[PDB]
Design an enzyme around this catalytic site. Structure first.
Site, mmCIF file in Angstrom:
data_model
loop_
_atom_site.group_PDB
_atom_site.id
_atom_site.type_symbol
_atom_site.label_atom_id
_atom_site.label_comp_id
_atom_site.label_asym_id
_atom_site.label_seq_id
_atom_site.Cartn_x
_atom_site.Cartn_y
_atom_site.Cartn_z
ATOM 1 N N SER A 21 0.375 11.264 -2.422
ATOM 2 C CA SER A 21 -0.684 10.968 -1.426
ATOM 3 C C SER A 21 -0.705 12.113 -0.400
ATOM 4 C CB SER A 21 -0.411 9.590 -0.873
ATOM 5 O OG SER A 21 -1.537 8.969 -0.274
ATOM 6 N N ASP A 69 -7.092 5.151 -9.371
ATOM 7 C CA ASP A 69 -6.860 5.215 -7.902
ATOM 8 C C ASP A 69 -8.194 4.990 -7.169
ATOM 9 O OD1 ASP A 69 -6.084 5.868 -5.232
ATOM 10 O OD2 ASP A 69 -4.631 7.367 -5.936
ATOM 11 N N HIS A 125 -3.349 3.671 -7.151
ATOM 12 C CA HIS A 125 -2.695 4.688 -6.289
ATOM 13 C C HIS A 125 -1.216 4.820 -6.642
ATOM 14 C CE1 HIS A 125 -1.923 7.570 -3.305
ATOM 15 N NE2 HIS A 125 -1.012 6.781 -2.732
HETATM 16 C C1 LIG Z 1 -1.574 8.709 1.156
HETATM 17 O O1 LIG Z 1 -0.685 9.148 1.852
HETATM 18 C C2 LIG Z 1 -2.693 7.958 1.816
HETATM 19 C C3 LIG Z 1 -3.612 7.376 0.757
HETATM 20 C C4 LIG Z 1 -3.080 6.210 -0.051
HETATM 21 C C5 LIG Z 1 -3.410 8.912 2.774
HETATM 22 C C6 LIG Z 1 -3.888 10.216 2.162
HETATM 23 C C7 LIG Z 1 -2.063 6.824 2.637
HETATM 24 O O2 LIG Z 1 -0.852 6.679 2.569
HETATM 25 N N1 LIG Z 1 -2.832 6.047 3.414
HETATM 26 C C8 LIG Z 1 -2.405 5.084 4.306
HETATM 27 C C9 LIG Z 1 -3.389 4.204 4.798
HETATM 28 C C10 LIG Z 1 -3.077 3.151 5.664
HETATM 29 C C11 LIG Z 1 -1.763 2.944 6.062
HETATM 30 C C12 LIG Z 1 -0.762 3.789 5.599
HETATM 31 C C13 LIG Z 1 0.659 3.533 6.062
HETATM 32 N N2 LIG Z 1 1.250 2.264 5.556
HETATM 33 C C14 LIG Z 1 1.747 2.439 4.163
HETATM 34 C C15 LIG Z 1 2.456 1.166 3.664
HETATM 35 N N3 LIG Z 1 3.619 0.895 4.538
HETATM 36 C C16 LIG Z 1 4.462 -0.226 4.071
HETATM 37 C C17 LIG Z 1 5.885 0.047 4.386
HETATM 38 C C18 LIG Z 1 6.531 1.065 3.692
HETATM 39 C C19 LIG Z 1 7.863 1.362 3.948
HETATM 40 C C20 LIG Z 1 8.558 0.644 4.912
HETATM 41 C C21 LIG Z 1 7.919 -0.370 5.615
HETATM 42 C C22 LIG Z 1 8.622 -1.083 6.576
HETATM 43 C C23 LIG Z 1 7.978 -2.094 7.274
HETATM 44 C C24 LIG Z 1 6.646 -2.372 6.995
HETATM 45 N N4 LIG Z 1 5.989 -1.671 6.064
HETATM 46 C C25 LIG Z 1 6.584 -0.676 5.361
HETATM 47 C C26 LIG Z 1 3.115 0.625 5.895
HETATM 48 C C27 LIG Z 1 2.363 1.844 6.440
HETATM 49 C C28 LIG Z 1 -1.074 4.849 4.732
#
Ligand SMILES: *C(=O)C(CC)(CC)C(=O)Nc1cccc(CN2CCN(Cc3cccc4cccnc34)CC2)c1
Ligand SMILES: *C(=O)C(CC)(CC)C(=O)Nc1cccc(CN2CCN(Cc3cccc4cccnc34)CC2)c1
Lengths: 843, 844
Positions: free
Chosen positions: B709, B787, B819
């Site tokens: 990503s 995706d 994705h």
């Molecule tokens: C790729 O990098 C893109 C496209 C898919 C941008 C180019 C991307 O990541 N977009 C994106 C959009 C909205 C929000 C986010 C960030 N979230 C990703 C999922 N994550 C869950 C999570 C992961 C690890 C640890 C953790 C701990 C507590 C709660 N959630 C998590 C939340 C943030 C990215």
């Protein structure tokens, strides 16, 4: 004894080799003039016998235009006349800026690479030319009453009130004031003189949801264009008729009406990649529904001032499906030259049964919602009016659609039709027959619902004379035709009589069938165009060692011995380019299989060969039906990259195995219901023969490479012969036959439900467990926009390779359909091929 | 001297990866979640509470509804592991071949849901009603309340419907649990669960055959709202009933977002049924192009004492949404005050630099009508003292991050003011809790007269704004983080980075007498907590880099007169930490100071069995984008086992949280504003060079850069800008052209293309292919074909540019993946391919 090692180049090193090979080729792509029309000149004082019209790219132009050359009455015997190409049209840009989806897909289906005017309609009596240009319709006049131009005239645009493109334009043969075109899936006529336009058919509602608007008139659908080589769905009646006491003239068009309602829909990405959208296709996958079809008749009446007074949609008195219940496809249609009968070539779904059927206009009645009016019309259809099945071809292999059907004029009160027909299923070799059918009347009540018995409408055959015979073919497909001189009773045709490696022009009598005279020079393969006055012909010809030329020949000698008219070289339309110093022609050979079948192959020997060296080898494969790779014609335009491989020290081998064409139906029929299962055996026998005969083949370093059917066989080679083929490069492979279309797949393999074993055995994506567990033995190449071999085939193969835990390399051509047309993509493909072979073709 | 990794056959690499992934398949999606505490009201019984949750116990192939019994007394010198009881009797929540409807499939992709079965439930405590999706239908069951607590699994009752197609986003009516709502074919429905009466409330969807001529929806979160604003609903139950009918009828209300996607660009994405060779159509607002036209509206229906639905009404704002709120581009969030007196909405402008919290009284909504005379009569009848109230406004020159914390207190001071807790980041540049009191003073409006509102129309005076928290650390307010408020004790419980940016901890502070913040969680672990609504117990799901996750239940114990200093006492375990494999070595967290004196955190996976004087080939694993922190003290072996696998083969693996990453304040995240690509790589290279100097075993001649990503984008940017640093790039699902990406994400960080041509051009790797290598085997591109966020187009366009520039590339596609890689066969093939590419090509 020793192994030759190819020089390993940098990627930019390979780019310079590929760019150099193409840029400094000493050959130009698609420079040959084509679509020839001879017109006689009728000025006894003037120096020219004929004007010759054609399409070509003149000097200092990047696009095809309408051209003519002057054919002189006399030429110096000890001098080579190169005819000057004269422009018909004044400084005119036929190409659009930087085509519509309709025109783009038509160029893909007709395998058209060149830009500008790609076809014209011509009316000889009036000297009218009609053609698509600048996303509009244009016309001009030359010869006939108007007389011959001496300088380029300006083409007159034909204005329209229609929305969207006007496709498939054709001049009315009976009255060249009128022409036809397709607009939004319906048939139109217009008067070219007055500018009046008139819609004839009302199948297409123009609804916002296109998938709720599934009927067309006058249009060849996807499978008909891609698998049956038919690009039109309507045919002008050649004559006018004079019904009613008002002095009105009736003109007629036969057309195919199609309903694609039940045909499966697939999405293919559109070439504007940045829009991230697809186009919807009615794609009949093997075993699924083809379109619902019928032949219908469009009529319109005209006054003496050329005003279109009335129009009428007419349909068969009983439905097409009732009269012809076993007909799946209309291959071909037309009219007898007197307009007395429409005719159609009908195929059953298995493509093992063909009928040639005459349809009198009297069998068609006005289309109506009013059931009482329809019954009145049906009651008025005479008992003596009916279809006539004048010819029937049946086989346990398959019908190849042959374009050769020439009906002779009938006598007044004659109940027989004499015609020339190309027929392959009779002897297993395509041959010319003179057939006399008796138009047998049974008497029919057309007001009653109809159920045809066995042999309904079947005409007795009084006579069927073989004009040609033997273990060779009359060429009757993919542009090949006959020319018939009714004055001299001679038929001119092309065939493989001298050798399966060369196309030649021949002539035989259809009255006193006997001696076949060859009109073309041995040692070359010829593509000929005959004057309608039978006084001159053009030959486009080449050999493996000589690039193509286009020569004009005079047929000369006593008129009382027309069969023995001598072909005399007259002038050149295009001289053969010099065979480049870096280009070494391939060598054609033949061998006998262990079963004593003769196969032809060719070898590109490693350049500057030294004795006691075994060279890494590329087997270049197609191996599918309807194609012959090995013949005596110039391969350096389309297959320059095979010479490039040989220049780096690869041996390149090409084998025409069983399944390939121009060897008769039995030879082609070896792959029936078992595609994949036999072709590799012949390829390996060829490779082993070449290794034994020539001695410079390293059998420990053989790559297999092909495109389409060749991509399919590249994967099959790696699956069935993993010890023979070190690497496979599979371009646009068919990987699952169940995803391919009705027209092609069912012809060779039947429907999936009837041949589960063949479909399973022949679908490479179902045998990924047998593909190599070593990396760098498999490269897959595919155009993203391919509308024939869908990217799905590669996507599905990859999905299966992942599931089986197999490695693969992948290249995609995002802007390419089936064949690579863009120079950057073509160069990148060739560089990638050279890199893959240099890194990974090792023992 | 240079360490050489052992070269393996492809099947050798398959065996190593297949072996490695047995451990991950033992621990991944094993944790119970979605906790509801219910107190038991039986002194004779041995249990204080029943605890409901979703879980996949060992043996199960799907998530189901479970409960555990919390005992009144526990042995101090014994570790109690709670028994997991099934709620549902032998019931398959998953559909056939795990093939969900497009609606349910896309929602699981957007909510990052990997498990099969029940993934969420609505719970009504008073009635004991559970409501959930299962088997492409709707089910319910009852436990506790009047009915009493089950002792064995009951069968879930399906809810019958005459609706065609899926019933999405089901919710219980809080005011009356006899009623529930759902979305069917882009319209809001309500139904009585007892009687089986169904009623359509909204009529936006005409149901036309041409779907592109049918562009309006009600109750639905559109593409950008779900993908970029983390909102999955477009409607909100009013929590109370009203009785304004003089026939003794009860009125129930639903606030809903109506959208019109008419002007929004359409893209096609392939559907997961590859053999059908079809695409689905998406209303995809690309950066700079039109977002949907939006409005808040009000669905009302009246019910009698027998629960029959007597009447329904569509109501809309007395003046159009676009007239009242002309600068609003997005509805971030909405809801009601707990008394149902006001609807509220969190509004964003298009630049996402201006946020408003707005109260909307139901009296401001009038019946929808084509009759202009009836509409004017309705507008005239709206009292002059009824209006919107802007109770809070956040403005920034960076961007607004949407914080989910807004807690309106009941109006126990009177009707002239509203007190609320609000998370605010833009005030200090760190996300903190504020207690705010807004003054609600009526200007007087004639709503029948047209008006274009001026600057600060409806803006409430702020009587009080107290910082409950402050400093260079954050209250966590996004992506699942929330607060819990005990109005008896005047305490707010929250999660934060106060102790360290490397750990989430549970904290408590007074909102009455703001002072001492008490930490409730153990240092040396990162905690994810669920608090009982009675504030007697909480669950913590917690881990460290060295310890796999456990789920522990804690009692808050001590004198009731000192609630701030209640002791968290370990009570029982829901899940103990798994044993680590012998060949799993935890990564080591470090920090360093950049040449600009910014502190950056990283972690290193040291080559296993390291020998001194050896330089090892190195993988820089990168994300580097906003809203993410890769480097924290939590277990990485579930999501990132492959980094340990690389280290076991003798690769060094480096991870750097550069500027642009989150949990370090708005200024730190803000460093990439309008220049994505340009600062992130500088910090990655400083981190790599620090690790090489500090640890001494990094071969800087053999560094691979790999990410997915934003990490795929940065892998390509590294190869373009630092070709002498990075020998190879492996770019997964890269953004290659920012002009092709969506409004919500791209404009937030980069502005619209016309305002930032330089930033868009500099940050679009597909426009710089001329700078990618002329040598083969330095670039591997990976992309999921399906995706729906980073379209395959990004890779297709990059390849088209690579061809035109005459550059070599390697490509792998995952035909069955969107994705993220979810299929185990795809995941294994990716990891085997990664190991093969590095072993063959990471040299010199
Ligand atoms: C790729 O990098 C893109 C496209 C898919 C941008 C180019 C991307 O990541 N977009 C994106 C959009 C909205 C929000 C986010 C960030 N979230 C990703 C999922 N994550 C869950 C999570 C992961 C690890 C640890 C953790 C701990 C507590 C709660 N959630 C998590 C939340 C943030 C990215
Ligand atoms: C791939 O192999 C597929 C799909 C594109 C099948 C899997 C395929 O080749 N299909 C196919 C459909 C219809 C007809 C053909 C065979 N034609 C190919 C084009 N060819 C034109 C041509 C080639 C060489 C020389 C020559 C000379 C005169 C006129 N035409 C030609 C005609 C045969 C294949």
């Amino acid at each position: 004894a020793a192994r030759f090692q190819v020089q390993k180049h940098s990627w930019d090193g390979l780019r310079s080799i590929i760019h150099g090979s193409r840029k400094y080729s000493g050959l130009i792509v698609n420079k040959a003039p084509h679509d020839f029309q001879f017109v006689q000149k009728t000025d006894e004082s003037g120096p020219h016998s004929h004007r010759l019209y054609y399409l070509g790219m003149p000097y200092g132009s990047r696009e095809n235009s309408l051209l003519y050359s002057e054919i002189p009455k006399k030429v110096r015997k000890e001098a080579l006349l190169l005819l000057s190409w004269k422009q018909m049209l004044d400084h005119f840009q036929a190409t659009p800026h930087h085509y519509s989806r309709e025109e783009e897909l038509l160029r893909e289906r007709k395998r058209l690479g060149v830009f500008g005017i790609t076809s014209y309609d011509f009316h000889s009596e009036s000297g009218l030319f009609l053609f698509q240009a600048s996303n509009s319709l244009f016309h001009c006049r030359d010869g006939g009453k108007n007389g011959f131009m001496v300088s380029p005239m300006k083409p007159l645009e034909i204005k329209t009130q229609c929305s969207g493109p006007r496709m498939d334009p054709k001049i009315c043969p009976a009255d060249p004031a009128f022409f036809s075109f397709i607009n939004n899936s319906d048939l139109w006529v217009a008067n070219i003189e007055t500018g009046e336009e008139r819609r004839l058919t009302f199948c297409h509602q123009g609804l916002s949801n296109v998938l709720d608007d599934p009927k067309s008139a006058g249009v060849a659908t996807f499978v008909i264009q891609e698998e049956f080589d038919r690009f039109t769905g309507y045919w002008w009646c050649p004559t006018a008729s004079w019904e009613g006491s008002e002095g009105l003239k009736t003109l007629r068009i036969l057309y195919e009406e199609v309903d694609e309602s039940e045909v499966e829909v697939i999405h293919v990405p559109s070439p504007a990649l940045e829009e991230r959208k697809t186009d919807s296709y009615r794609y009949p996958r093997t075993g699924s529904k083809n379109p619902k079809i019928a032949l219908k008749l469009a009529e319109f009446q005209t006054d003496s001032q050329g005003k279109i007074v009335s129009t009428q949609e007419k349909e068969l008195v009983q439905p097409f499906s009732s009269l012809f219940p076993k007909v799946e496809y209309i291959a071909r249609a037309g009219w007898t030259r007197d307009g007395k009968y429409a005719w159609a070539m009908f195929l059953d779904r298995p493509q093992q049964w063909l009928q040639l059927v005459l349809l009198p206009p009297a069998l068609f009645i006005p289309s109506t919602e009013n059931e009482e009016q329809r019954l009145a019309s049906a009651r008025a259809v005479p008992r003596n009016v009916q279809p006539y099945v004048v010819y029937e071809e049946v086989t346990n292999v398959w019908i190849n659609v042959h374009d050769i059907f020439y009906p002779f004029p009938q006598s007044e009160g004659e109940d027989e039709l004499c015609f020339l027909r190309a027929n392959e299923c009779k002897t297993g070799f395509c041959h010319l027959y003179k057939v006399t059918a008796v138009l047998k009347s049974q008497g029919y009540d057309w007001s009653e619902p109809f159920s045809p018995g066995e042999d309904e409408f079947k005409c007795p055959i009084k006579e069927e004379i073989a004009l040609t015979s033997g273990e060779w073919e009359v060429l009757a497909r993919h542009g090949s035709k006959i020319w018939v001189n009714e004055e001299t009773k001679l038929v001119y045709f092309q065939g493989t009589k001298d050798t399966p490696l060369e196309h030649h022009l021949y002539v035989v009598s259809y009255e006193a069938a006997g001696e076949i005279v060859r009109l073309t020079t041995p040692g070359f393969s010829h593509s000929c165009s005959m004057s309608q006055n039978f006084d001159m012909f053009v030959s486009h010809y080449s050999s493996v060692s000589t690039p193509p030329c286009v020569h004009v020949y005079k047929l000369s000698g006593p008129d009382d011995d027309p069969l023995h008219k001598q072909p005399r070289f007259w002038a050149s339309m295009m001289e053969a380019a010099s065979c480049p110093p870096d280009y070494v022609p391939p060598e054609i050979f033949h061998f006998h299989t262990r079963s004593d079948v003769r196969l032809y192959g060719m070898i590109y020997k490693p350049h500057a060969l030294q004795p006691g060296k075994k060279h890494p080898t590329v087997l270049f494969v197609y191996g599918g039906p309807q194609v012959q790779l090995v013949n005596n014609s110039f391969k350096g335009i389309k297959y320059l990259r095979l010479n490039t491989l040989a220049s780096l020290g690869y041996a390149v081998v090409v084998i025409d195995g069983r399944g390939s064409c121009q060897r008769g139906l039995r030879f082609e029929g070896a792959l029936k219901n078992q595609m994949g299962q036999v072709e590799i055996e012949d390829q390996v026998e060829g490779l082993q023969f070449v290794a034994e005969k020539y001695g410079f083949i390293d059998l420990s370093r053989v790559a297999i490479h092909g495109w389409s059917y060749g991509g399919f066989l590249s994967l099959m080679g790696l699956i069935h012969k993993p010890q023979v083929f070190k690497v496979a490069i599979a371009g646009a492979p068919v990987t699952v036959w169940m995803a391919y279309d009705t027209g092609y797949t069912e012809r060779y393999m039947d429907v999936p439900e009837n041949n589960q074993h063949g479909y399973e055995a022949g679908s490479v994506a179902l045998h990924v467990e047998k593909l190599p567990n070593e990396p760098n033995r498999l490269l897959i190449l595919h155009g993203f926009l391919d509308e024939n071999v869908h990217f799905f085939h590669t996507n599905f193969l990859v999905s299966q390779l992942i599931r089986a835990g197999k490695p693969y390399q992948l290249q995609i051509y995002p802007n390419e359909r089936h064949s690579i047309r863009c120079p950057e993509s073509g160069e990148h493909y060739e560089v990638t091929l050279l890199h893959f072979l240099q890194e990974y073709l090792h023992h």
